[PDB]
Amino acid sequence: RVRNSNVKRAAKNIVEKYFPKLDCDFHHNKRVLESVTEIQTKRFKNQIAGYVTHLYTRVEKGKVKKIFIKKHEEERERRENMIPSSSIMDTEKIEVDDITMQMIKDYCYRGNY
Amino acid sequence: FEQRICTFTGRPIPHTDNASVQLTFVELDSDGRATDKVLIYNVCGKIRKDGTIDEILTNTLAQ
Amino acid sequence: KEIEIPEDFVKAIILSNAHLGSTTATTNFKQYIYGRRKNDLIHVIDINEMWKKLIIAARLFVSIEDPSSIIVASNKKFGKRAVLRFCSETGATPLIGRFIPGGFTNQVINDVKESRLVVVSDTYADKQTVMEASYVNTPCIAFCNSDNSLSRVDVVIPMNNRSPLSIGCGFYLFAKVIKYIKGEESFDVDVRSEIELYFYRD
Amino acid sequence: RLNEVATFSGHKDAVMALGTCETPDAKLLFSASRDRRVLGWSLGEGAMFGRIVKEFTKHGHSVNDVAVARSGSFVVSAGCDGLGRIIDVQSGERTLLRGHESDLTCAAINCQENKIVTGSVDKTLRLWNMCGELQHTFDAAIECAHEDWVMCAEFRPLDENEVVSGSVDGTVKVWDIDARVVKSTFFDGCLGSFAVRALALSADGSCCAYGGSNCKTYILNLAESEAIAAFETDTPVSALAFGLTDVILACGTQDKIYIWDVVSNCLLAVADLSAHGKRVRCRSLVWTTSNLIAGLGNGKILVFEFV
RNA sequence: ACCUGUCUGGUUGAUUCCGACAACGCGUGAGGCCUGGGGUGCAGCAGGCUGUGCGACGGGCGGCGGCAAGCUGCAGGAGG
């Protein structure tokens, strides 16, 4: 069945606040949920903890664009710092097409068609 | 009572116009640094939405 | 006098293809056009007109007391780090992705500050922000392409926004003139290492 | 240099714990699992090897750990229903342990089979003796006791009554229980992402190891209370045991089996379990005198021979 | 006047949700819920009785859809 915003916004908060304490197995993922929240009825725990596992599977792939986890940007900034092959050194004697050089005739360098 | 005369048109800025914008510009030094004094500019509403506020502000600030 | 472009900076914008303007130019853009390529039917933008609109935009930026009041926005994902590397540097407030409409008018939402200037990457992509700025008496600088609309834009920076490096170069140079206007940093920047943070690499 | 010899029929859900015993000419294996049963496996002659001998199915929920005596007379069960049990494998009859609040996680028996420790998610690890007598609860009365669940706990073998205890805060807290005071609390070798899930003890009792949820394993000598070495793992390593008659370790993670030499501090071999299942997850491998036996999160229990 | 919010599309028994979005946040209803029914853990007592819990969430896997929501088959299971 389809979960609602009372479950999905809840389970979004659980994976967002408490991501490292979670795991892909559901029964461990429910065992954190009584320890760390207060949810009254045992069916509605299973509604939430089920969708937490359905979130934690795709956040393990990192697919969701909304939620944001402290580990997942510090790993991202390592990926952000590419060893830079910027073409400012790679381009030598820049080939600029015939009319593009004429606009730079006042102050010019690296002239090629 | 007083109403802001728009600088570029010379017209008064219309009554309670939201598109009317205050424009502030610091005077620029000879080497290109900021100075404490500021050019203060009044812009009418309709000249923004026409898009003609750009080319007039180019030639005014070119002076 | 007039500030001269560094050979360092003009090295960037040719391989940015920022002068590779567009196929179409409006009559509001023809003063930013020295010529058009007769081969590819592409208008080539004036660099000298591009550079002086940058320093006016930098002049308009610093004129507010607090740069954090300025809300700079970019809809596309090309300029996601171009506005993120900007606001860590310039000390402004970033807006990324879809601008939620009513972000300046509706007072039930208080995510960001009440703007005293906005600058956008594209008026086509951020038509919602440039309209919403006009409702609250807020100025608008914009990077504007050769085909782009320029209504409700105070300062047009004629430059391309349809390349991933292009707004990354433009937001870089706009950050470069800002501390040059304050005198915080001269043009001794060594672009080898700095502009790549603005660049969209994935 | 590892060879997967055989497999077991096994359960229909994740095996939480494995355990063996040194008996007069019989090698039992007790496999605790998530389908509320713990099986008894013999490993003798090859026709008898791999056949179910004992079976206990009266637990309420997942038997999160099991503990086999070095004498082999009895088997201590740790269940997620909240009640540990001490099962007499010849009788088939069990006692009960009522102390914990909820969801008991780990269990261990003394070298001398006098006392048993049971750890749970209620921030407690309560000790029982062989009759069901709750002697002491180690929650907050002793200072430097961890503030979350205890996922694993064991006994130091040659040491008389020292108990090791891994927890969700990443602190492997070890204490002498002779006087109820904490001896040491480790953190990455020095003294909730960092979360040790299972630990192992050596035969000589000095060498010890603990994996974790920080994708790292730390191997340390408790007598010096110093870290021997450290070994890095791809996924959050869960399973951990120690090799018999050699200074050799074997870690099991979500997908792979890392057999790490201690004294050489280099990786001897790796076995991947991706061939079997997709939700394969090795929980609680354990060594025998012949060859090490590793259980899986789908239900199969795989037998490997080391070279 | 009204419209948007309250929706192109996809989805659901559900205006249930995913998503794009001049809307953003909420609220009823829906759900959650309460009772009975099956499985068994403990406890108490004597056509066996009644307390206390556990157990299923669509979780796992395969294929569609992929910010997906979800749909569908199988295994496991007392129960889908």
CSV table of all heavy atoms in Angstrom, one decimal, chain A residues 3-6 8 30 41-43 46-47 54 58 65-66, chain E residues 17 19 31-33 54-55 57-59 67-70:
chain,number,residue,atom,x,y,z
A,3,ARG,N,2.1,4.7,1.5
A,3,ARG,CA,2.3,5.4,2.8
A,3,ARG,C,1.8,6.9,2.6
A,3,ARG,O,1.7,7.4,1.4
A,3,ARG,CB,3.7,5.4,3.2
A,3,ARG,CG,4.1,4.2,4.1
A,3,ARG,CD,4.4,2.9,3.3
A,3,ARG,NE,5.7,2.9,2.6
A,3,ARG,CZ,6.0,2.1,1.6
A,3,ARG,NH1,5.1,1.2,1.2
A,3,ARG,NH2,7.2,2.1,1.0
A,4,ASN,N,1.6,7.6,3.7
A,4,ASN,CA,1.1,8.9,3.6
A,4,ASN,C,2.1,9.9,4.1
A,4,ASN,O,3.2,9.5,4.5
A,4,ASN,CB,-0.2,9.1,4.4
A,4,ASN,CG,-0.2,8.4,5.7
A,4,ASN,OD1,0.7,8.7,6.5
A,4,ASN,ND2,-1.2,7.5,6.0
A,5,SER,N,1.8,11.2,4.2
A,5,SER,CA,2.7,12.2,4.6
A,5,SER,C,2.9,12.1,6.1
A,5,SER,O,3.9,12.6,6.6
A,5,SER,CB,2.2,13.6,4.2
A,5,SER,OG,0.9,13.7,4.4
A,6,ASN,N,2.0,11.5,6.9
A,6,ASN,CA,2.3,11.3,8.3
A,6,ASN,C,3.4,10.2,8.5
A,6,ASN,O,4.0,10.2,9.5
A,6,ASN,CB,1.0,10.8,9.0
A,6,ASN,CG,-0.1,11.8,8.8
A,6,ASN,OD1,-1.2,11.5,8.5
A,6,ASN,ND2,0.2,13.1,9.0
A,8,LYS,N,5.7,9.3,5.7
A,8,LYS,CA,6.9,9.6,4.9
A,8,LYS,C,7.7,10.8,5.4
A,8,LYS,O,8.9,10.8,5.5
A,8,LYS,CB,6.4,9.9,3.4
A,8,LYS,CG,5.9,8.7,2.7
A,8,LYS,CD,5.8,8.9,1.2
A,8,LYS,CE,5.4,7.6,0.6
A,8,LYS,NZ,5.1,7.8,-0.8
A,30,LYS,N,14.0,-1.4,13.1
A,30,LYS,CA,12.9,-1.1,14.0
A,30,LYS,C,13.4,-1.0,15.4
A,30,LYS,O,12.8,-0.2,16.2
A,30,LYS,CB,11.8,-2.1,13.8
A,30,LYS,CG,10.5,-1.7,14.5
A,30,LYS,CD,9.5,-2.8,14.3
A,30,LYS,CE,9.9,-4.1,15.1
A,30,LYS,NZ,8.9,-5.2,14.8
A,41,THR,N,1.6,3.0,18.7
A,41,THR,CA,1.0,1.8,18.3
A,41,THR,C,1.9,1.0,17.4
A,41,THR,O,2.6,1.5,16.6
A,41,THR,CB,-0.3,2.0,17.6
A,41,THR,OG1,0.0,2.6,16.3
A,41,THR,CG2,-1.1,3.1,18.4
A,42,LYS,N,1.9,-0.4,17.6
A,42,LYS,CA,3.0,-1.2,17.1
A,42,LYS,C,2.8,-1.4,15.6
A,42,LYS,O,3.8,-1.7,14.9
A,42,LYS,CB,3.0,-2.5,17.8
A,42,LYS,CG,1.8,-3.4,17.5
A,42,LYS,CD,2.0,-4.8,18.2
A,42,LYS,CE,3.3,-5.5,17.8
A,42,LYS,NZ,3.4,-6.8,18.5
A,43,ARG,N,1.6,-1.2,15.0
A,43,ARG,CA,1.5,-1.2,13.6
A,43,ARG,C,2.2,0.0,12.9
A,43,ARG,O,2.9,-0.1,12.0
A,43,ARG,CB,0.0,-1.4,13.2
A,43,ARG,CG,-0.2,-1.1,11.7
A,43,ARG,CD,-1.5,-1.8,11.3
A,43,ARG,NE,-2.0,-1.1,10.1
A,43,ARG,CZ,-1.7,-1.4,8.8
A,43,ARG,NH1,-0.8,-2.4,8.6
A,43,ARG,NH2,-2.2,-0.8,7.8
A,46,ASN,N,5.8,-0.2,12.5
A,46,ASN,CA,6.1,-0.9,11.3
A,46,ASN,C,5.9,-0.2,10.0
A,46,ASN,O,6.5,-0.4,9.0
A,46,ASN,CB,5.3,-2.2,11.3
A,46,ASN,CG,5.4,-3.0,12.6
A,46,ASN,OD1,6.3,-2.8,13.3
A,46,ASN,ND2,4.4,-3.8,12.8
A,47,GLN,N,4.9,0.8,10.0
A,47,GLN,CA,4.7,1.7,8.9
A,47,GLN,C,5.9,2.6,8.7
A,47,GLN,O,6.4,2.8,7.6
A,47,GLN,CB,3.5,2.5,9.1
A,47,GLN,CG,2.2,1.7,9.3
A,47,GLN,CD,1.5,1.3,8.1
A,47,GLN,OE1,1.1,0.1,8.0
A,47,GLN,NE2,1.3,2.2,7.2
A,54,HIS,N,13.1,1.5,3.4
A,54,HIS,CA,12.9,1.8,2.0
A,54,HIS,C,13.6,3.1,1.6
A,54,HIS,O,14.0,3.4,0.5
A,54,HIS,CB,11.5,1.9,1.5
A,54,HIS,CG,11.3,1.7,0.1
A,54,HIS,ND1,10.1,2.1,-0.5
A,54,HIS,CD2,12.1,1.3,-0.9
A,54,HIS,CE1,10.2,1.8,-1.8
A,54,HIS,NE2,11.4,1.4,-2.1
A,58,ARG,N,17.9,3.4,-0.7
A,58,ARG,CA,18.2,4.4,-1.7
A,58,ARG,C,19.1,5.5,-1.3
A,58,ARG,O,19.7,6.2,-2.1
A,58,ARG,CB,16.9,4.9,-2.4
A,58,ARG,CG,15.8,5.2,-1.5
A,58,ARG,CD,14.5,5.5,-2.2
A,58,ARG,NE,14.6,6.8,-3.0
A,58,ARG,CZ,13.5,7.5,-3.3
A,58,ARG,NH1,12.3,7.1,-3.0
A,58,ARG,NH2,13.7,8.6,-4.0
A,65,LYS,N,17.4,13.6,-3.5
A,65,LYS,CA,18.0,15.0,-3.6
A,65,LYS,C,17.6,15.9,-2.4
A,65,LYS,O,18.1,17.0,-2.4
A,65,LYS,CB,17.5,15.6,-4.9
A,65,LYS,CG,17.9,14.8,-6.2
A,65,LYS,CD,17.4,15.5,-7.4
A,65,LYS,CE,17.9,14.7,-8.6
A,65,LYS,NZ,17.4,13.3,-8.7
A,66,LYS,N,16.7,15.4,-1.5
A,66,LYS,CA,16.3,16.3,-0.5
A,66,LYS,C,17.2,16.2,0.8
A,66,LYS,O,17.7,17.3,1.2
A,66,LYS,CB,14.8,16.0,-0.1
A,66,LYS,CG,13.8,16.6,-1.0
A,66,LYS,CD,13.5,15.8,-2.2
A,66,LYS,CE,12.9,14.5,-1.9
A,66,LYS,NZ,12.6,13.7,-3.1
E,17,C,P,-0.9,11.8,1.5
E,17,C,OP1,-0.2,12.0,2.8
E,17,C,OP2,-1.9,12.8,1.1
E,17,C,O5',0.2,11.6,0.4
E,17,C,C5',1.5,11.2,0.7
E,17,C,C4',2.1,10.4,-0.4
E,17,C,O4',1.1,9.9,-1.2
E,17,C,C3',3.1,11.2,-1.3
E,17,C,O3',4.3,11.4,-0.8
E,17,C,C2',3.1,10.3,-2.5
E,17,C,O2',3.9,9.2,-2.4
E,17,C,C1',1.6,9.8,-2.6
E,17,C,N1,0.8,10.5,-3.5
E,17,C,C2,0.8,10.2,-4.8
E,17,C,O2,1.6,9.3,-5.3
E,17,C,N3,0.0,10.8,-5.7
E,17,C,C4,-0.8,11.8,-5.2
E,17,C,N4,-1.6,12.4,-6.1
E,17,C,C5,-0.9,12.1,-3.9
E,17,C,C6,-0.1,11.4,-3.0
E,19,G,P,9.8,12.9,-5.0
E,19,G,OP1,11.2,12.5,-4.6
E,19,G,OP2,9.2,14.0,-4.3
E,19,G,O5',9.9,13.2,-6.5
E,19,G,C5',9.8,14.5,-7.0
E,19,G,C4',9.1,14.6,-8.3
E,19,G,O4',7.8,14.0,-8.2
E,19,G,C3',8.8,16.0,-8.8
E,19,G,O3',9.9,16.7,-9.4
E,19,G,C2',7.6,15.8,-9.6
E,19,G,O2',7.9,15.3,-10.9
E,19,G,C1',6.8,14.8,-8.8
E,19,G,N9,6.0,15.4,-7.8
E,19,G,C8,6.2,15.4,-6.5
E,19,G,N7,5.3,16.1,-5.8
E,19,G,C5,4.4,16.5,-6.8
E,19,G,C6,3.2,17.2,-6.6
E,19,G,O6,2.7,17.6,-5.6
E,19,G,N1,2.6,17.4,-7.8
E,19,G,C2,3.1,16.9,-9.0
E,19,G,N2,2.3,17.2,-10.1
E,19,G,N3,4.2,16.3,-9.2
E,19,G,C4,4.8,16.1,-8.0
E,31,G,P,-9.4,4.8,6.6
E,31,G,OP1,-9.8,3.4,6.3
E,31,G,OP2,-10.0,5.5,7.7
E,31,G,O5',-7.8,4.8,6.8
E,31,G,C5',-7.0,4.2,5.8
E,31,G,C4',-5.6,4.7,6.0
E,31,G,O4',-5.5,6.2,6.0
E,31,G,C3',-4.9,4.5,7.4
E,31,G,O3',-4.4,3.1,7.5
E,31,G,C2',-3.9,5.5,7.5
E,31,G,O2',-2.7,5.2,6.7
E,31,G,C1',-4.6,6.7,6.9
E,31,G,N9,-5.3,7.6,7.8
E,31,G,C8,-6.6,7.7,8.0
E,31,G,N7,-7.0,8.5,8.9
E,31,G,C5,-5.8,9.0,9.4
E,31,G,C6,-5.5,9.9,10.5
E,31,G,O6,-6.4,10.5,11.2
E,31,G,N1,-4.2,10.0,10.7
E,31,G,C2,-3.2,9.4,10.0
E,31,G,N2,-1.9,9.7,10.3
E,31,G,N3,-3.4,8.6,9.0
E,31,G,C4,-4.7,8.4,8.8
E,32,G,P,-4.8,2.2,8.8
E,32,G,OP1,-4.1,0.9,8.6
E,32,G,OP2,-6.2,2.3,9.0
E,32,G,O5',-4.0,3.0,9.9
E,32,G,C5',-2.6,3.1,10.0
E,32,G,C4',-2.1,4.1,10.9
E,32,G,O4',-2.7,5.4,10.5
E,32,G,C3',-2.6,3.9,12.3
E,32,G,O3',-1.8,3.0,13.1
E,32,G,C2',-2.5,5.3,12.9
E,32,G,O2',-1.2,5.7,13.2
E,32,G,C1',-3.0,6.1,11.7
E,32,G,N9,-4.4,6.4,11.7
E,32,G,C8,-5.4,5.8,10.9
E,32,G,N7,-6.6,6.2,11.1
E,32,G,C5,-6.4,7.1,12.2
E,32,G,C6,-7.3,7.9,12.9
E,32,G,O6,-8.6,8.0,12.7
E,32,G,N1,-6.7,8.7,13.8
E,32,G,C2,-5.4,8.7,14.1
E,32,G,N2,-5.0,9.5,15.1
E,32,G,N3,-4.5,8.0,13.5
E,32,G,C4,-5.1,7.2,12.5
E,33,C,P,-2.5,1.7,13.7
E,33,C,OP1,-1.5,1.1,14.7
E,33,C,OP2,-3.0,0.9,12.6
E,33,C,O5',-3.7,2.2,14.5
E,33,C,C5',-3.6,3.0,15.7
E,33,C,C4',-4.9,3.8,15.9
E,33,C,O4',-5.4,4.2,14.7
E,33,C,C3',-6.0,3.0,16.6
E,33,C,O3',-5.8,2.9,18.0
E,33,C,C2',-7.2,3.7,16.1
E,33,C,O2',-7.4,4.9,17.0
E,33,C,C1',-6.8,4.2,14.7
E,33,C,N1,-7.4,3.4,13.7
E,33,C,C2,-8.7,3.5,13.3
E,33,C,O2,-9.4,4.4,13.8
E,33,C,N3,-9.2,2.8,12.3
E,33,C,C4,-8.4,1.9,11.7
E,33,C,N4,-8.9,1.1,10.7
E,33,C,C5,-7.0,1.7,12.1
E,33,C,C6,-6.6,2.4,13.0
E,54,C,P,4.7,-5.5,21.6
E,54,C,OP1,5.5,-4.3,21.3
E,54,C,OP2,3.3,-5.5,21.2
E,54,C,O5',5.4,-6.8,20.8
E,54,C,C5',6.7,-7.1,21.0
E,54,C,C4',7.0,-8.5,20.6
E,54,C,O4',6.1,-9.4,21.1
E,54,C,C3',6.9,-8.7,19.1
E,54,C,O3',8.0,-8.3,18.4
E,54,C,C2',6.7,-10.2,19.0
E,54,C,O2',7.9,-10.9,19.2
E,54,C,C1',5.8,-10.5,20.2
E,54,C,N1,4.4,-10.6,19.9
E,54,C,C2,3.9,-11.7,19.3
E,54,C,O2,4.6,-12.7,19.0
E,54,C,N3,2.5,-11.8,19.1
E,54,C,C4,1.8,-10.8,19.4
E,54,C,N4,0.5,-10.9,19.2
E,54,C,C5,2.3,-9.6,20.1
E,54,C,C6,3.6,-9.6,20.3
E,55,G,P,7.8,-7.4,17.0
E,55,G,OP1,9.2,-7.2,16.5
E,55,G,OP2,6.9,-6.3,17.3
E,55,G,O5',7.1,-8.5,16.0
E,55,G,C5',7.8,-9.6,15.5
E,55,G,C4',6.9,-10.5,14.8
E,55,G,O4',5.9,-11.1,15.7
E,55,G,C3',6.1,-9.9,13.7
E,55,G,O3',6.8,-9.7,12.5
E,55,G,C2',4.9,-10.8,13.5
E,55,G,O2',5.3,-12.0,12.8
E,55,G,C1',4.7,-11.2,15.0
E,55,G,N9,3.7,-10.4,15.6
E,55,G,C8,3.9,-9.3,16.4
E,55,G,N7,2.8,-8.7,16.9
E,55,G,C5,1.8,-9.5,16.3
E,55,G,C6,0.4,-9.4,16.4
E,55,G,O6,-0.3,-8.5,17.0
E,55,G,N1,-0.3,-10.4,15.7
E,55,G,C2,0.4,-11.3,15.0
E,55,G,N2,-0.4,-12.2,14.3
E,55,G,N3,1.7,-11.5,14.9
E,55,G,C4,2.3,-10.5,15.5
E,57,C,P,1.8,-4.3,10.3
E,57,C,OP1,2.3,-4.2,11.7
E,57,C,OP2,0.4,-4.5,10.1
E,57,C,O5',2.3,-3.0,9.5
E,57,C,C5',2.5,-3.0,8.1
E,57,C,C4',3.9,-2.5,7.8
E,57,C,O4',4.9,-3.4,8.3
E,57,C,C3',4.2,-2.3,6.3
E,57,C,O3',3.7,-1.0,5.9
E,57,C,C2',5.7,-2.4,6.3
E,57,C,O2',6.3,-1.2,6.5
E,57,C,C1',6.0,-3.3,7.4
E,57,C,N1,6.4,-4.7,7.1
E,57,C,C2,5.8,-5.6,6.2
E,57,C,O2,4.8,-5.4,5.6
E,57,C,N3,6.4,-6.8,6.0
E,57,C,C4,7.5,-7.2,6.6
E,57,C,N4,8.0,-8.4,6.4
E,57,C,C5,8.2,-6.3,7.5
E,57,C,C6,7.6,-5.1,7.7
E,58,G,P,2.4,-0.9,4.9
E,58,G,OP1,2.4,0.5,4.5
E,58,G,OP2,1.2,-1.5,5.6
E,58,G,O5',2.7,-1.8,3.7
E,58,G,C5',3.7,-1.4,2.7
E,58,G,C4',4.8,-2.4,2.7
E,58,G,O4',4.3,-3.7,2.7
E,58,G,C3',5.8,-2.3,1.6
E,58,G,O3',7.1,-2.6,2.0
E,58,G,C2',5.3,-3.4,0.6
E,58,G,O2',6.3,-3.9,-0.2
E,58,G,C1',4.8,-4.5,1.6
E,58,G,N9,3.7,-5.3,1.1
E,58,G,C8,2.5,-4.8,0.8
E,58,G,N7,1.7,-5.7,0.3
E,58,G,C5,2.5,-6.9,0.4
E,58,G,C6,2.2,-8.2,0.0
E,58,G,O6,1.1,-8.6,-0.5
E,58,G,N1,3.3,-9.0,0.2
E,58,G,C2,4.5,-8.7,0.7
E,58,G,N2,5.4,-9.6,0.8
E,58,G,N3,4.8,-7.4,1.0
E,58,G,C4,3.8,-6.6,0.8
E,59,G,P,8.4,-1.8,1.5
E,59,G,OP1,8.3,-0.4,1.9
E,59,G,OP2,8.5,-2.2,0.0
E,59,G,O5',9.6,-2.5,2.2
E,59,G,C5',9.8,-2.4,3.6
E,59,G,C4',10.5,-3.5,4.2
E,59,G,O4',9.6,-4.5,4.7
E,59,G,C3',11.4,-4.3,3.3
E,59,G,O3',12.6,-3.7,3.0
E,59,G,C2',11.5,-5.6,4.0
E,59,G,O2',12.5,-5.5,5.1
E,59,G,C1',10.2,-5.8,4.6
E,59,G,N9,9.3,-6.6,3.7
E,59,G,C8,8.2,-6.3,3.0
E,59,G,N7,7.7,-7.3,2.4
E,59,G,C5,8.5,-8.3,2.7
E,59,G,C6,8.4,-9.7,2.3
E,59,G,O6,7.5,-10.2,1.6
E,59,G,N1,9.4,-10.5,2.9
E,59,G,C2,10.4,-10.0,3.7
E,59,G,N2,11.2,-10.9,4.1
E,59,G,N3,10.4,-8.8,4.1
E,59,G,C4,9.5,-8.0,3.5
E,67,C,P,13.8,10.4,-12.0
E,67,C,OP1,12.3,10.5,-12.1
E,67,C,OP2,14.5,11.6,-12.5
E,67,C,O5',14.1,10.3,-10.4
E,67,C,C5',15.5,10.5,-10.0
E,67,C,C4',15.6,10.4,-8.5
E,67,C,O4',15.7,11.7,-7.9
E,67,C,C3',14.5,9.6,-7.8
E,67,C,O3',15.0,8.8,-6.8
E,67,C,C2',13.6,10.8,-7.3
E,67,C,O2',12.8,10.4,-6.2
E,67,C,C1',14.7,11.8,-6.9
E,67,C,N1,14.2,13.2,-6.9
E,67,C,C2,14.4,14.0,-5.8
E,67,C,O2,15.0,13.4,-4.9
E,67,C,N3,14.0,15.2,-5.8
E,67,C,C4,13.4,15.7,-6.9
E,67,C,N4,13.0,17.0,-6.8
E,67,C,C5,13.2,15.0,-8.0
E,67,C,C6,13.6,13.7,-8.0
E,68,A,P,15.4,7.3,-7.0
E,68,A,OP1,15.4,6.6,-5.7
E,68,A,OP2,16.6,7.3,-7.9
E,68,A,O5',14.2,6.7,-7.9
E,68,A,C5',13.1,6.0,-7.2
E,68,A,C4',12.0,7.0,-6.9
E,68,A,O4',11.5,7.7,-8.0
E,68,A,C3',10.7,6.4,-6.3
E,68,A,O3',10.9,6.2,-4.9
E,68,A,C2',9.7,7.5,-6.6
E,68,A,O2',9.8,8.6,-5.6
E,68,A,C1',10.2,8.1,-7.9
E,68,A,N9,9.4,7.5,-9.0
E,68,A,C8,9.6,6.2,-9.6
E,68,A,N7,8.8,6.0,-10.6
E,68,A,C5,8.0,7.2,-10.7
E,68,A,C6,7.0,7.6,-11.6
E,68,A,N6,6.5,6.9,-12.5
E,68,A,N1,6.5,8.9,-11.4
E,68,A,C2,7.0,9.6,-10.4
E,68,A,N3,8.0,9.4,-9.6
E,68,A,C4,8.5,8.1,-9.8
E,69,A,P,10.2,4.9,-4.3
E,69,A,OP1,10.7,4.7,-2.9
E,69,A,OP2,10.3,3.8,-5.3
E,69,A,O5',8.6,5.3,-4.1
E,69,A,C5',8.2,6.4,-3.3
E,69,A,C4',6.9,6.8,-3.6
E,69,A,O4',6.9,7.4,-5.0
E,69,A,C3',5.8,5.8,-3.6
E,69,A,O3',5.3,5.5,-2.3
E,69,A,C2',4.8,6.3,-4.6
E,69,A,O2',4.0,7.3,-4.0
E,69,A,C1',5.7,7.0,-5.6
E,69,A,N9,6.0,6.1,-6.8
E,69,A,C8,6.9,5.2,-6.9
E,69,A,N7,7.0,4.6,-8.0
E,69,A,C5,6.0,5.2,-8.7
E,69,A,C6,5.5,5.0,-10.0
E,69,A,N6,6.0,4.1,-10.9
E,69,A,N1,4.5,5.8,-10.4
E,69,A,C2,4.0,6.7,-9.6
E,69,A,N3,4.4,7.0,-8.3
E,69,A,C4,5.4,6.2,-8.0
E,70,G,P,5.3,4.0,-1.7
E,70,G,OP1,4.2,3.9,-0.8
E,70,G,OP2,6.7,3.7,-1.3
E,70,G,O5',5.0,3.1,-3.0
E,70,G,C5',3.7,2.6,-3.2
E,70,G,C4',3.3,2.6,-4.7
E,70,G,O4',4.4,3.1,-5.4
E,70,G,C3',3.0,1.2,-5.3
E,70,G,O3',1.7,0.8,-5.0
E,70,G,C2',3.3,1.5,-6.8
E,70,G,O2',2.2,2.1,-7.4
E,70,G,C1',4.5,2.5,-6.7
E,70,G,N9,5.8,1.9,-6.8
E,70,G,C8,6.7,1.8,-5.8
E,70,G,N7,7.8,1.2,-6.2
E,70,G,C5,7.6,0.8,-7.5
E,70,G,C6,8.4,0.2,-8.4
E,70,G,O6,9.5,-0.3,-8.3
E,70,G,N1,7.8,0.0,-9.7
E,70,G,C2,6.5,0.5,-10.0
E,70,G,N2,6.1,0.3,-11.2
E,70,G,N3,5.7,1.1,-9.1
E,70,G,C4,6.3,1.3,-7.9
